[PDB]
Design a protein around this ligand. Structure first.
Ligand SMILES: CCCCCCCCCCCCCCCCCC(=O)OC[C@H](COP(=O)([O-])OCC(O)COP(=O)([O-])OC[C@@H](COC(=O)CCCCCCCCCCCCCCCCC)OC(=O)CCCCCCCCCCCCCCCCC)OC(=O)CCCCCCCCCCCCCCCCC
Ligand SMILES: CCCCCCCCCCCCCCCC(=O)OC[C@H](COP(=O)([O-])OCC[N+](C)(C)C)OC(=O)CCCCCCCCCCCCCCC
Ligand SMILES: CCCCCCCCCCCCCCCC(=O)OC[C@H](COP(=O)(O)OCCN)OC(=O)CCCCCCCCCCCCCCC
Ligand SMILES: CCCCCCCCCCCCCCCC(=O)OC[C@H](COP(=O)(O)OCCN)OC(=O)CCCCCCCCCCCCCCC
Ligand code: HEM
Lengths: 110, 431, 352, 126, 352, 126
């Protein structure tokens, strides 16, 4: 058999994102989970590259956030990606939950 | 040694093998099951079974003859094999009961019984002959909406509305003299044959068959008649191959012989020189597969046809044999080329020389109809051994690298992944 | 060891070695099938892989078939590779390795597959049951191994060096010159075989008439009649076969198949009617034997059977030259019967 | 989640009574024609959720022709919703052929399961 | 409907209904076994689950078995619950639902299992082959459904309507009163059956002698001889069976088991000799028939078979009272033969 | 990791030349009885790693008696290593019954796989 089905990590990645049999008639509302996974990875990455500069005292929290905003290179990008990707994360999550409770995927097998 | 002479009308082609016994004289027309519309289809098979009927075969058997026929996708043949001292009897029987009046053959008792038996055997072929019907569906979806797409035996829905008017119209439109070739194999000499065709006047018509409006163009398609009652999974995929009288014909047959044919239960076919049999033999991914190379008049196919009892790993078999197909373009060796050269010479020798003088009649009639004269077994062997690895690489880059395929399946084929993965696994990213 | 070849100006030759080692001469039944599936395997010099690969590089094909009398070892090659294939057939006749590890791995699954394929067709079961009720333990051993009598490896070795003797076999071929074939069969290891006794005995093999067997089988039903024939009356039954399954009769639409199996000593004329429904098998075989019990005239089928026997004795190496002109009529006497399939809706031998 | 014998007893009490039938059956017909499952080529007995054990037994007890036609209607609904179109006007399921072909099987299966769970909790005379 | 039972002052009773619907009276073959496996399925009033659980709470059990002639529905209960079990047998005779979902889910797997079990044992194979070559289409229909003749629910329904009639059956019982059982077979759904035709034939069933069947089988070898006996020669063959499978003869060390199956018309005396070995079975059955072709004394076996006949007749309540005293001697004449297993090392009929 | 044909070749060359034999086999015997795989009741051909394809085929070609004795010796070695004891002096594998029983099957299986590997890398003269 194939190497993407034989190797243990590649068999997991295969069975989840390569040849996982999805139903033939799903529309654009089922892509919100992939969008939520991407936006979660976005939040984690920009959060790490902000926490490399954020100091969490009481005398340095807001001053360190506005030090990220003003002095570190492309820090305005990182802070606005975090603070806006959180809002987009929750809006795509609300769409995910509303799709789930509209199309009846709270029902008997899941 | 395969001599051809054009007479007033017909073309005579013969080969005299003086050690064979049964000399076999027949006429081979150049209008098969791809020279009609899809509504009168099966009239070629109906003509074949009218010629092979009880009346005609009893008349031929009382005199000492044995009838034969073979319908293919551009030529159809009518062969009267016989004893070597008795072929003027063959010639005037084929004159008196096929070329002149056929009113004894075409009245509504013999035609009704023949049509009923043809209907029964065509539906028995459709239900109980599974690899040939998916090769036929492969032909029907590869060249679709275009006259090479037709079933050879004919479909059931376009066979119950056929009467003697259809057969008489087809015999007026396609049983011509600029369309026919009379052949002689076995041990008849050439000049007594044409002496007996020119003594008794034998000419069918004078005109010319109607030329088609649409040439055979490949359309990359897909079809699946999944019947999960069946125990196996017969699929077959094929690309556009080179037709007859093309310069890249023998390299197509050689590239088919590179991958050969296999049978998982015979212990002498499990030990061949194929690299695919080290991938498909540790989980037993298939039962048999055969790489054909069919070459019709306008275009042709190139692919393999398999059967699989392990219906969960179908996509792995497809993926492994398609990576082996990409090995033709990128990194084919020379020992595979020489192994396929010797095996292709063996296969063409087993095809061209055999004991039966009616298969030689059909092959000689076809390749004198399309080409004009028969090339010998020596010139074919020379053209085979004049093939280098770079000619195979150039042909494989021409006709196999990222080309459109057509798939035809049946049985338990949900495990067959659908089309775009199979299409874009014909081209890999260089490993 | 009789070397009998002929020449032709073509490209592809064949070399065959025929031994008298079918299920006519099997000690336990299914031993000849195991030897036939055993044939082209590991020699003591080279493998079954090296032989196949280097012969494919040299351009040829080995095969080994099995019928009731012979085991045929055929090799089809390009014409200029005669001494290698002569030496390969001599190697595989002399010194096959006979290992248990390849008996279980490669021979027994092939035998099981061939037995399942020949079982799932309902006409081969009727044919070998017809043999087993006509000739009891002569020609009537079953053709294929089926696991009834347990065959060891030592029985296969004993049968193999019983049957692979020099006076028993003979070598024929197409498109080889006789001088080079007779020079390559000598200076070989086919000449250094043990010169054992030839196995064929030429008197007629003691048939039994008026016997019936009824086999239960799911699927499609057959009914088969079978007449053991002598050596003198071989021509009349050959004309009868080529008359019955031909358009001269009105009985060709009922008879699905009919054939005469010929041997050295005599033969067996068999006749199968197969259908999916079974009342049609009952009425068809009743009409067939009730019309064959009256006298049929067989002289119109003489030229046609001369044609059919020329074209069937084209490529065999055992031509029997029958006369076909002392044939005038036929009237059926006593006949063995076997009914396979839907067995309760099939007529008995008293009903026919 | 609601057993079909309950829906069956409520619906048969609505249908066999005169004053409720001609006042609730027209709004039911308009509700079914407004739901739009017939425009995709579907009877209602394809719409029912299948991941019960009752529906699994009722779909394995279906005849072998209605099962093939049901699989074709489901697959055609999948494809004609994949294209985001509807079926043409000649291939809509007409109101005369929305017969319940599955409901007798589901009623007998749920009656069998209800009798099984009624017999497992039986109480003899104490 | 001739209900008649007997009484004894004890606790556990049984009540049986014998219809004449075995494999003797089957229209297609395998129908009666499918009806027997279909017997205690769900009726039109209560299911096959409610009946089983409720009768387990009431203290009893049901069974349904099939011999060559009878289908007997048996109910074993405590004595204080007679009319419930009478009404249950009346309901299961009258109004079985005959559902296809109960055919394919619950009845066909049981029939497949029972056919596989009775096929993996070579004695039952020899017995039914001996039946089918003695009596052809009468008693010799196959007992179990194997799928050879495809039978679906309509033939089972029509056969149940043919055989489940009023004047066809009989009602037996032990440890019940006779008067209230006669009152309880009335007041019921068993007297409202259609008063159909009786099925028992008074003619003796047209046997055939001197016939041999040889069936190939993997496992143990069985040689079985079989003699169809009349109604006057029933005692002589009964004492012959009880003389042969006893210590009085020299032959019970060779004979595995010999038994006479009795019917109202005649009977069939079968004799089975089996082993793993096949030369053992060969010499054994040759010695058996070569000693039985001489005259055997049947005088010391009379009191012993009176014992064995009493212990065999107290179980059934259709006793055929033989007098056992007009017996003097035995001499074997013509006999049917069947050889199952390793057939090529088993003797034929003219060798015996 | 190392082919048994190479081990057999080096061992045959060490063995059948009399200068190296009388110097190499006594230290080999002392190394074997100092190794201590015979105190657990094991022959040597149980110790070989069974996770190559060569060893897997060489085990599936083993006869039916030596396979059962091999499985018993492996299980007994597992148990007496579990209890952290040794087998008693009666149940030690003696040096005369430390016969190589798996080695012909290993040699012929690796010879077959080796011949396959160099038959499919063959080149005709060009
Ligand atoms: C999330 C999306 C997951 C998508 C998975 C996928 O597309 O696999 C399908 C497909 C499955 O093919 P298959 O059926 O196993 O065919 C195997 C045959 O041997 C034929 O397969 P092949 O030989 O054509 O594919 C081998 C492939 C395998 O490549 C790799 O594994 C390493 C890629 C780095 O080699 C390459 O991709 C070479 C191109 C490297 C790209 C360089 C430019 C991008 C830099 C990154 O694999 C690919 O097309 C490879 C996609 C690229 C690798 C994924 C990179 C993810 C990085 C994060
Ligand atoms: C809201 C904007 C989208 C509204 C909309 O487009 O609704 C129409 C669809 C109809 O649904 P449909 O799946 O298309 O069904 C019709 C299919 N035919 C039969 C025609 C083939 O309905 C849908 O597309 C379903 C969308 C519903 C979910 C998305 C809206 C989410 C808004 C936020 C909700 C927050 C919920 C918080 C929960 C805690
Ligand atoms: C370096 C390039 C080497 C190319 C060799 C080659 O071509 O890899 C070919 C092999 C398949 O080979 P095969 O099965 O045909 O071999 C058969 C031999 N018996 O695919 C691979 O290795 C990897 C498959 C690629 C597709 C999956 C990629 C997933 C990446 C991880 C992403 C994880 C994110 C989610 C968490
Ligand atoms: C359960 C759900 C969990 C989440 C599931 C995963 C969701 C993934 C969502 C993110 C999409 C990843 C895209 C990968 C594309 C790929 O990898 O391209 C693999 C394909 C293989 O194509 P082919 O050879 O088969 O055919 C093709 C014809 N022969 O190469 C391509 O076409 C190349 C196309 C361009 C690739 C770059 C596109 C941009 C990617 C970067 C941005 C990603 C964001
Ligand atoms: C679940 C995903 C996450 C969400 C929804 C999220 C959301 C938020 C929000 C809304 C803020 C406030 C921004 C503002 O001031 O308006 C914030 C602040 C912050 N988050 Fe996250 N966060 C996530 C993950 C992470 C992770 C994993 C880290 C650490 C690696 C991180 C690091 C930070 C930091 C350092 C701040 C400080 C203020 C700033 O610079 O923005 N975040 N987060």
């Amino acid at each position: 058999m194939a190497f993407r089905k034989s190797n243990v990590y590649l068999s997991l990645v295969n069975s989840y994102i390569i040849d996982s049999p999805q139903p033939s008639s799903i529309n654009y509302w089922w892509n919100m989970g992939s969008l939520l996974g991407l936006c979660l990875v976005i939040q984690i990455v920009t959060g790490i590259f902000m926490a490399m500069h954020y100091s969490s005292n009481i005398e340095l929290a807001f001053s360190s956030v506005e030090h990220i905003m003003r002095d570190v290179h492309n820090g305005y990008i990182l802070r606005y990606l975090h603070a806006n990707g959180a809002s987009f994360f929750f809006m795509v999550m609300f769409m995910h939950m509303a799709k789930g409770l509209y199309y009846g995927s709270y029902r008997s097998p899941r | 040694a395969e001599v051809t002479q054009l007479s007033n009308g017909i073309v005579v082609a013969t080969e005299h093998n003086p050690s064979a016994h049964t000399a076999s004289v027949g006429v081979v027309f150049g209008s098969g099951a791809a020279n009609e519309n899809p509504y009168n289809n099966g009239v070629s098979n109906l003509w074949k079974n009218i010629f092979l009927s009880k009346e005609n075969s009893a008349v031929a058997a009382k005199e000492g003859l044995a009838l034969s026929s073979n319908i293919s996708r551009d030529f159809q043949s009518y062969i009267v094999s016989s004893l070597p001292g008795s072929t003027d009897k063959s010639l005037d029987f084929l004159n008196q009961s096929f070329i002149q009046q056929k009113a004894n053959l075409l009245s509504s008792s013999n035609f009704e019984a023949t049509k009923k038996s043809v209907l029964k055997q065509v539906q028995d072929f459709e239900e109980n002959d599974h690899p040939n019907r998916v090769l036929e569906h492969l032909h029907s979806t590869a060249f679709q909406n275009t006259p090479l797409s037709l079933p050879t035996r004919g479909t059931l829905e376009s066979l119950e509305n056929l009467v003697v008017a259809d057969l008489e119209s087809f015999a007026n439109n396609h049983f011509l003299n600029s369309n026919a070739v009379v052949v002689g194999t076995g041990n008849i000499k050439h000049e007594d044959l044409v002496n007996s065709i020119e003594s008794k006047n034998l000419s069918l018509q004078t005109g010319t068959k109607p030329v088609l409006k649409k040439k055979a163009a490949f359309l990359g398609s897909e079809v699946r008649l999944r019947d999960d009652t069946l125990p196996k999974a017969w699929i077959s995929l094929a690309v556009e191959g080179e037709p007859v009288n093309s310069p890249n014909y023998f390299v197509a047959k050689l590239a088919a012989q590179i991958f050969g044919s296999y049978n998982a239960f015979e212990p002498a076919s499990r030990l061949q020189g194929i690299k695919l049999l080290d991938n498909i033999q540790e989980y037993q991914l298939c039962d048999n597969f055969n790489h054909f190379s069919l070459s019709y008049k306008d275009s042709g196919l190139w692919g393999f046809s398999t059967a699989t009892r392990n219906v969960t790993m179908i996509d792995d078999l497809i993926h492994f044999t398609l990576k082996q197909w990409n090995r033709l373009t990128i990194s084919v060796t020379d020992t595979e080329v020489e192994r396929a050269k010797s095996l292709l010479k063996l296969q063409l020798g087993q095809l061209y020389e055999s004991g039966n003088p009616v298969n030689d009649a059909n092959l000689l009639g076809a390749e004198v109809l399309i080409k004009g004269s028969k090339l010998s077994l020596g010139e074919a062997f020379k053209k085979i051994d004049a093939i280098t690895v770079k000619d195979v690489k150039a042909w494989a880059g021409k006709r196999l690298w990222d080309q459109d395929i057509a798939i035809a399946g049946t049985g338990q084929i949900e495990g067959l992944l659908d089309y775009m993965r199979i299409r874009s696994d014909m081209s890999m990213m260089r490993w | 060891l009789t070397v009998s070849a002929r020449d032709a100006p073509t490209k592809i030759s064949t070399l065959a070695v025929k031994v008298h080692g079918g299920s006519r001469y099997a000690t336990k039944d299914g031993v000849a099938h195991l030897l036939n599936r055993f044939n082209f395997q590991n020699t003591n010099t080279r493998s079954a892989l090296k032989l196949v690969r280097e012969s494919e590089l040299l351009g040829g094909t080995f095969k080994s078939t099995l019928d009731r009398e012979y085991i045929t070892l055929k090799a089809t090659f390009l014409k200029d590779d005669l001494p290698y294939y002569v030496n390969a057939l001599a190697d595989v006749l002399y010194k096959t390795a006979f290992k248990p590890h390849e008996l279980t791995e490669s021979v027994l699954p092939a035998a099981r597959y061939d037995y399942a394929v020949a079982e799932q067709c309902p006409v081969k079961s009727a044919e070998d049951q017809l043999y087993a009720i006509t000739f009891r333990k002569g020609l009537g051993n079953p053709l294929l191994y089926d696991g009834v009598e347990r065959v060891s490896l030592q029985d296969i070795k004993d049968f193999a060096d019983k049957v692979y003797t020099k006076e028993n076999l003979e070598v024929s071929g197409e498109n080889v010159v006789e001088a080079d074939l007779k020079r390559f069969v000598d200076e070989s290891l086919l000449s250094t075989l043990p010169a054992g006794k030839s196995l064929v005995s030429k008197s007629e093999p003691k048939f039994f008439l008026g016997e019936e067997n009824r086999v239960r089988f799911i699927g499609d039903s057959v009914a088969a009649i079978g007449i053991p024939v002598n050596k003198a009356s071989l021509a009349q039954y050959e004309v009868l076969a080529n008359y019955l399954t031909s358009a001269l009769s009105e009985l060709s639409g009922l008879i699905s198949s009919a054939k005469l199996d010929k041997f050295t000593d005599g033969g067996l004329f068999t006749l199968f009617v197969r259908d999916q429904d079974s009342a049609v098998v009952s009425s068809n075989i009743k009409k067939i034997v009730a019309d064959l019990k009256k006298g049929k005239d067989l002289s119109p089928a003489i030229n046609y059977t001369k044609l059919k026997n020329a074209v069937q004795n084209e490529s065999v190496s055992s031509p029997i030259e029958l006369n076909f002109d002392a044939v005038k009529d036929f009237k059926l006497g006593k006949f063995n019967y076997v009914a396979v399939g839907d067995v309760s809706n099939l007529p008995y031998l008293d009903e026919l | 989640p609601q057993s079909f014998t309950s829906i069956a007893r409520i619906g048969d009490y609505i249908l066999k009574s005169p004053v409720l039938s001609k006042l609730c059956v027209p709004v039911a017909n308009q509700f079914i024609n407004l739901a739009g499952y017939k425009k995709l080529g579907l009877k209602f007995d394809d719409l029912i959720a299948e991941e019960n054990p009752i529906m699994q037994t009722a779909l394995r007890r279906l005849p072998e022709d209605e099962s093939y036609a049901r699989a074709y209607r489901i697959i055609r609904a999948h494809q004609t919703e994949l294209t985001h179109h509807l079926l043409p006007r000649n291939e809509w399921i007409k109101a005369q052929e929305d017969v319940p072909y599955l409901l007798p099987y589901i009623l007998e299966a749920e009656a069998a399961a209800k009798e099984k769970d009624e017999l497992d909790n039986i109480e003899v005379s104490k």
